[PDB]
Amino acid sequence: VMYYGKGDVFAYRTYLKPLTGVRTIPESPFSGRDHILFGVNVKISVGGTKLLTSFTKGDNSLVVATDSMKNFIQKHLASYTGTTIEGFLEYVATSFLKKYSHIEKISLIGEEIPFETTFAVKNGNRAASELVFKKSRNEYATAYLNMVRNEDNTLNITEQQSGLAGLQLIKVSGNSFVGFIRDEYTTLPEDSNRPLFVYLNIKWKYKNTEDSFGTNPENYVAAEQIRDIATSVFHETETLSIQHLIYLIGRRILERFPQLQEVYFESQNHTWDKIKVYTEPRPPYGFQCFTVTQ
Amino acid sequence: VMYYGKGDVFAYRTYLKPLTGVRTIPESPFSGRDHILFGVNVKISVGGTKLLTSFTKGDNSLVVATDSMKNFIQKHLASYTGTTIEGFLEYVATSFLKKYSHIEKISLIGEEIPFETTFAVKNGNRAASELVFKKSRNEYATAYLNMVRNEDNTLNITEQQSGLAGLQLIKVSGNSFVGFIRDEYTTLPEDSNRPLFVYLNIKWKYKNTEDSFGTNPENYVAAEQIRDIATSVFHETETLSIQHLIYLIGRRILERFPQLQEVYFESQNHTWDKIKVYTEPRPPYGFQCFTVTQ
Amino acid sequence: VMYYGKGDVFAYRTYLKPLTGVRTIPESPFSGRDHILFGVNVKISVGGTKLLTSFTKGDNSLVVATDSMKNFIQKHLASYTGTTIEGFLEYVATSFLKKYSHIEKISLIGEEIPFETTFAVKNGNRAASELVFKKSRNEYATAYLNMVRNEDNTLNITEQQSGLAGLQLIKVSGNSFVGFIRDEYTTLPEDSNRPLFVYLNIKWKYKNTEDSFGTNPENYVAAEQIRDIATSVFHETETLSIQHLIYLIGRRILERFPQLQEVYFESQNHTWDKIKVYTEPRPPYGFQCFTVTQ
Amino acid sequence: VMYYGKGDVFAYRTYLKPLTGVRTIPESPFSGRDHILFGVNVKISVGGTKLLTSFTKGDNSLVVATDSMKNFIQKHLASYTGTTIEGFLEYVATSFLKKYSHIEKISLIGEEIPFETTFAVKNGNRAASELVFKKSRNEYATAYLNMVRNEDNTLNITEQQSGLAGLQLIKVSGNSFVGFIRDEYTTLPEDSNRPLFVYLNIKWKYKNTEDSFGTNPENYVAAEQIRDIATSVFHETETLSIQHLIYLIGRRILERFPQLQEVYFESQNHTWDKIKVYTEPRPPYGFQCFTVTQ
Ligand SMILES: O=c1[nH]c(=O)c2nn[nH]c2[nH]1
Ligand SMILES: O=c1[nH]c(=O)c2nn[nH]c2[nH]1
Ligand SMILES: O=c1[nH]c(=O)c2nn[nH]c2[nH]1
Ligand SMILES: O=c1[nH]c(=O)c2nn[nH]c2[nH]1
Ligand SMILES: [Cl-]
Ligand SMILES: [Cl-]
Ligand SMILES: [Cl-]
Ligand SMILES: [Cl-]
């Protein structure tokens, strides 16, 4: 391995081009993003065989300073004319490889920094503020992009993934976990009605990478919509396990978005202990990792 | 000082008596709490001169185990018939001092563990779920109560305070900070239009402690309403400083809620640096502490 | 309440004047600090009736910018000729009140950012490096100072306190907790031999505040010595409770340091659950608070 | 992907068999581990085609409860007769695959929970305590193991890696970063003498995975020794970049330990800003990733 880069490149932009013209689904009222306030946390990694001597000899001649990568990202958020974090990453990646010919590969991660609307009274009525926003520490959208320079100096995207991270959902009833193996290592009682509490990280990949950019917004899959599918399916389902639940969420996602190739889940179990009153469990947490494919 | 107790006593209760019959204000649509899911994090501290030898001699005869305090709190959440965290603390405090005659003082802190509603499609339409909730890591209500046993075994509340913690608000324009002292220690440029980003912790005290319990809900002051006042005032105000803003929020709170005696602010400045694009500042943060009284 | 200021003012200084000539005690090898690297996290709070209109009118005329306070602290670390965090706080406080006549009160907290020595080899001989240090996230020294301007314009230290924070000690055997109250709320079994795990925060006050500055190092009480006293007493004692333990630690501190007036403890219980193998408990933690006086 | 398991399985064992007979090197005083206290944080992931219906049909028949996996790990720590985290992972993995024939693959991560020795005095003499230990939140050893069941029912380790995580080192002088690319995105000044502050995560792989277990202790590579090599090389080197430094650390490690096949570095740059006094930078951090092979 041989890479270097910059992490935690925060950048906040006001009045990005709004996202509109999206295609709706029954589970979600989502109809676009105002983009009055747009924040992203970017990580950039770069590689290339010409970087070897920066390690083996301490030769910095071909080293783009990581501070300069930070400047690069922040400047490009100012000039970005698109509507999605996915499109922003492509803009940065393409621009970076065009600028720095000795770099052979670039990886980017972008995490939304979410803000929520607030309300204010003005001119006699209470309404959504166009000025004041609440920083949210709950779920957030993510995007990943990897781009390579080929021998002929053409650029190719080699991997793209979008996601939703930090979703924490508890369903107070209508969940069971029974029928599991009962042997000499088992002390967990069967439970026909538990308040299942899951952490969900959901990632999806498009059949066609272009659909991720938002340039034809009707083909874009919004994290907001994925969130609403997850909550609806959780509500609808008499769950038999977390495994059972996330398969069903995945199937619904792929049904609602035929342009997707696959969905990947990372879930954690944080269900409370019963002492109706419950309390926090000991630290160990179950987890599940599962891919659903078209 | 001589106290001991238990912290991080999480307790989650389903179907607490709903809070309704509240008195509305223009800034807030708040009309009550469903209490399908009610979570609280309690810290309990107890004192009394009869605890001395548990320190000086290692004599545990009069020691209520802190583990037993945790059991006490969780059991009382199960039996609580009221509608507010403030009332829960009074219930716990009175009960504890009645049980344990050698304890002279008890302090309680209760922090709301907030959950947000989610949507689900059932029977043809999308509607708020009565089963699935989203755990929120954003702002949360707080309550504080101290109670003492007098010589005649009567119990008195000696301090009560309610609050709202973890409110993080950014206003993208309509904020200035100019005219401050410019001397040999000053490098901060004057700024006629900054995206002021404040953390707010707001605490209020009632003229009549009975009003905090929710037994006559029309006299209760809800953290939700306080939150909505803060966002409204922030929006309305061409801020001149954080100091200026929190005084105005305080004045409005006291105007809307004549039954309050005072409001106390702890604010922090987390305003982004301009590189329109902004980024995270260095770690040092400004803060302000201010009390507004009727 | 009416204060404002700056928190998380990190400042790192190289080659501070070394602390030397400290009176040693049996429990500790500590004799001083080389101060090749000296890190502090400072919080400054200031008050004064002349600050009122900065809140009530948005008048910034007598506002020292919190950014400027940060500059003030960092510039004074560069000029500081003393040898302790306690002395540094006094230097900053006195200087600030001398500079800004409209300020009546200043409160300072200083937390050590600790660094540990590392090994390097020269001529086949391994010894402590004078260049490379390890940043520690374990225990750290603290200092507190409050200074006020009197009506006759004299300056007075109204409160001073030193401390040790973040000490986490586990004793694998030789600890009991038995004989506590057993009633309807008690589920905790008696334990004649538990691996007591305590978090300790220890704070001391001097009879004479001048002794805290270290200008006469024979009278200075180092956090390192307090640490070594705590571990020695823990080792020596068949503990009967945390309450029992911290009283004995306090007595030993006051015996070793007659120049101290009091020692104040804040302890927490994080003892593992037994399944010899143990595991982490549920989140609730016991705590104790106790002052021992000379 | 199709896996599930348990994370944050903390387990603390007293009086594990001591690690003895480790070959000492000039950079380090390390000669073994007393293992009076032995703490590990384990993550277990398992897979197999037969787990499919637990996802697709909600069939729990072949589900080992994640709670049971926790029980399995903790019971095996109790019976483990070896001397290393690496060996413990092998013990758990082999045991688990022997028990559960429907499981085709198991991945294990083990992270040391480190404790440090403390001092105690008896009859006027200070020595290391055999009873009281200090929990450390600084650097810690890691181990990774992946094991699979083949078609002929033999078991095979497919991946093994050891490591040192959480090392934070600052060298106060003797570091430069100059000669990097200066173009339209470069604002970083060259620095001929910076107080380079690096976070290091170092991982190594053995030529023979058997050497990782410690059964032949002369071939075991201790994380403590890797730490002391890293600090020695940092001290000795006039660093030209972090890239330059980690290459040299890697080369020294492979020189000292011919039984190793590779060393992999993940570093981060956290160097302070100069205001001699320095302060914390803005959040963005540089990072470097490099593999040195034998
Ligand atoms: O949904 C669940 N899946 C599991 O694998 C499991 N194991 N314990 N509890 C569990 N719950
Ligand atoms: O609102 C503000 N108040 C202050 O006191 C201050 N100081 N620097 N910036 C500031 N902003
Ligand atoms: O040392 C202890 N003190 C206490 O007060 C306590 N309560 N539960 N366990 C305890 N241990
Ligand atoms: O050691 C460094 N490597 C880098 O790549 C770099 N970029 N900015 N500063 C840096 N320092
Ligand atoms: Cl689970
Ligand atoms: Cl400020
Ligand atoms: Cl306790
Ligand atoms: Cl860097």
Q: Is B281 touching D (CB cutoff 8 A)?
A: yes
| Residue B177 assigned as binding residue | yes
CA distances to B31, B89, B218, B219, B247 from B21, rounded to whole Å, are 8, 21, 6, 10, 30
Closest CA to ligand 2's atom 11: B241
* Torsion from C-alpha of C23, C26, C32, C38, nearest 10 degrees: -130
Q: Which residue has the tokens 């896996």?
A: D3
* Option in C37, C169, C279 nearest D172 (CB): C37
* CA distance to A209, C131, C139, D194, per residue, from C15 (Å): 56, 11, 22, 15
DSSP string, B206-251: ESSGGGGSSSSGGG---HHHHHHHHHHHHHH--BS-HHHHHHHHHH
Q: Where are the alpha helices (DSSP H) in D6-84?
A: 52-56, 66-79
Catalytic residue among C43, C66, C117, C209: C66
Kindly list the distances between the CA atom of residue C82 and the CA atoms of B158, C17, C69, in Å, as whole numbers in the listed order.
Answer: 45, 6, 20
Positive or negative CA dihedral for A243, A245, A248, A250? negative
Sign of the Cα torsion A73, A78, A84, A90 reads negative
Query: Between the CA of residue D55 and those of A240, A249, C235, D185, what are the distances in Å?
Result: 10, 11, 52, 50
Q: Closest partner residue to C236 among D120, D228, D234, by Cβ? A: D120
Query: What b/e sequence results for A75-105 when a residue is b if at least 16 CB atoms lie within 10 Å of its CB, and e otherwise?
Result: bbbeebebbbbbbbbbbbbebbbeebeebbb
Q: Which of C103, C102, C107, C104 lies closest to C92 in space, CA to CA?
A: C107
Q: How far apart are CA D191 and CA B138, in angstroms?
A: 41
Instruction: Report the alpha-carbon distance of residue D19 to residue D16 in Å, rounded.
Output: 9
CB-nearest to B11 from A37, A133, A277 is: A277
The answer to whether the CB of B159 falls within 8 A of the CB of B143 is no
CA angle C228, C232, C237 (to 5 degrees): 150
What residue has token string 């061409």?
A: B238
- In this structure, the number of other CB atoms found within 10 A of the CB of residue C205 comes to 20
Residue of C nearest to D35 (CA): C172
Contact status of D53 with chain A (Cβ, < 8 Å): no
Q: Does D7 touch chain B (CB under 8 A)?
A: no
Cβ–Cβ pairs < 8 A, chains C and D: 181
Chain A positions in Cβ-Cβ contact with residue B200 (cut-off 8 Å): none
Q: What is the DSSP letter of D190?
A: P
CA distances from C29 to A167, C260, D119 (A): 51, 20, 10
Residue in the block written with tokens 């005083």: D29
- CA dihedral (B99, B102, B106, B110) in degrees, to 10, reads -40
Nearest CA to ligand 4 atom 2: D241
Distance (Å, rounded) from C-alpha B27 to C-alpha B228? 6
Cβ burial of A188 (10 Å; 0-12, 13-18, 19+) is: middle
- Structural tokens at position D227: 């730490």
Give the β-pairing of A197-206 and B140-149: unpaired
Of D58, D70, D180, the CB nearest to A241: D58
Residues of B in contact with C10 (CB under 8 A): 283-284
CA atoms within 13 A on the CB side of C95: 18
What token pair was written down for A280? 């926090």
CB contact under 8 A, C188 and B68: yes
Cα separation, B172 vs B192, whole angstroms:
12
- Are residues A181 and D65, on separate chains, in Cβ contact within 8 Å? yes
Give the closest residue to C288 by CA, choosing from C272, C258, C265.
C265
CA distance B229 to B9: 31
The reply to whether residue C11 touches residue D278, judged by beta carbons under 8 angstroms, is yes
Pairing of strands D37-47, A285-293: unpaired
Q: Count CB-CB contacts under 10 A for residue A55.
A: 23
Q: How far apart are CA C171 and CA C173, in angstroms?
A: 6
- Whole-angstrom CA distances from D266 to A43, A165, C58, D203, D242 are 15, 24, 49, 9, 10
D178 and A CB contact within 8 Å: yes
Collapsed DSSP state (helix, strand, coil) of residue D24: coil
CB C162 within 8 A of CB C129: no
Determine whether C99 is an active site residue. Answer: no
- Minimum CA–CA partner of C37 in chain D: D172
Whole-number Å distance between alpha carbons of A285 and A269: 6
**Nearest alpha carbon to residue D268 among D243, D233, D293, D294:** D243
Q: How far is CA D207 from CA A1, C108, C114, D217, D226, in A?
A: 18, 56, 38, 15, 17
Set of chain B residues whose Cβ sits within 8 Å of the Cβ of D282? 273, 279-282
Which of C6, C171, C203, C205 is catalytic? The answer is C6
Distance from CA of residue C177 to its chain's centroid?
Answer: 29
* Ligand 4 atom showing the smallest separation from residue D196 Cα: 1
Contact A171, A195 (CB under 8 A): yes
Using DSSP bridges, classify how beta strands C273-274 and A197-206 pair: parallel, antiparallel or unpaired: unpaired
Nearest of D284, D291, D282, D285 to residue D249 by alpha carbon: D291
Distance CA D149, CA D106 (A): 9
Extract the runs of DSSP E, i.e. beta strands, from B16-135.
Answer: 37-47, 105-113, 115-122, 125-135
Resolution in A: 1.7
**What is the phi/psi pair of residue D283, to 5°?**
-60, -35
Type of residue found at C126: R
B236-259: burial string, b at 16+ Cβ within 10 Å, e else? bbebbbbbbbbbbbbebbbebbeb
Q: Which of B44, B51, B64, B66 to mutate to test the pocket of ligand 3 (most atoms within 8 A of CB)?
A: B66
Atom of ligand 4 nearest to the CA of A67: 8
Would residue A283 be called left, alpha or beta, if left means φ above 0 and alpha means ψ between -120 and 50 degrees? alpha
Q: Which of A45, A66, A70, A71 is the pocket-test mutation for ligand 4 (most atoms within 8 Å of CB)? A: A66
Tell me whether residues C286 and B5 touch, CB distance under 8 A: yes
Residue B220: CA count within 13 A, CB half-sphere: 24
Residues after which chain B is broken (C–N above 2.5 A) are 275
Sorted by where each begins, the domain ranges of chain C are 1-294
Closest Cα partner for B18 from B86, B89, B74, B82? B82
**Which token pair is D137?**
């939140």
* Chains touching chain D, criterion 3+ CB pairs below 8 Å: A, B, C
Enumerate neighbours of A (3 or more CB pairs within 8 A): B, C, D
Q: Which residues line ligand 4 (CB under 6 A)?
A: A 4, 63, 65-67; D 177, 188, 241-243, 269, 286
| β-pair partners for B201 | B266
Q: Touching check for C180 and chain B: CB below 8 Å?
A: yes
Task: List phi, psi (to 5°) of D149.
Answer: -95, 125
Q: Residue D267: beta bridge partners?
A: D200, D288
Write phi, then psi, for D153 (nearest 5 degrees): 70, 5
For residues D257 and D220, give the distance between their C-alpha atoms in angstroms, rounded to a whole number.
Answer: 9
- The Cα D287–Cα D243 span in angstroms is 9
Q: Decide: residue B102, CB within 10 A, 0-12 exposed, 13-18 middle, 19+ buried.
A: middle
CB D85 within 8 A of CB D35: no
With CA atoms as reference, report the closest residue to D84 among D212, D254, D248: D212
Report how far residue D44's alpha carbon sits from residue D65's, in angstroms, rounded to the nearest whole number.
12
Residues of D in contact with A199 (CB under 8 A): none
Q: Where are the alpha helices (DSSP H) in chain C?
A: 52-56, 66-79, 85-99, 223-236, 242-256
**CA–CA gap between residue B139 and residue D218 (Å, rounded):** 56
Would the CB atoms of D187 and A71 count as touching at under 8 Å?
A: yes
Q: Give the three-state DSSP class for A207.
A: coil
**Residues from chain C contacting residue D171 (CB–CB below 8 Å):** 131-133
HSE-up of D197 (CA within 13 Å, CB side)?
17
Q: Which fold has domain D1-294?
A: Urate Oxidase (3.10.270)
Exposure b/e, C163-187, CB count within 10 A at least 16 = b: bbbbbbbbbbebbbbeebbeeebee
Give the C-alpha distances (Å, rounded to integers) separating B206 from A131, B37, B227, B267, D282.
32, 27, 17, 21, 42
d(CA A29, CA A228): 9
Q: Name which of D224, B269, B16 is nearest C65 in CA terms.
A: B269
| Amino acid symbol at C81 | T
Interface membership of A238 toward C (CB under 8 Å)? no
The half-sphere exposure of B268 on its side-chain side, counting CA atoms within 13 A, is 15
Residues whose CB falls within 8 Å of the CB of residue C100, separated by 6 or more in sequence, listed in order: C46, C64
Tokens of A233: 């399916």
Cβ B265 vs Cβ B226: under 8 Å: no
- State the smallest CA–CA distance between residue D73 and chain A in angstroms: 10
Burial class (CB in 10 A: 0-12, 13-18, 19+), C34: middle
Give CA–CA dist D193/D238, Å, rounded: 10
Six-digit token string for A171: 């369903």
- Tell me the Ramachandran region of residue A192: left when phi exceeds 0, alpha when psi lies from -120 to 50, beta otherwise: alpha
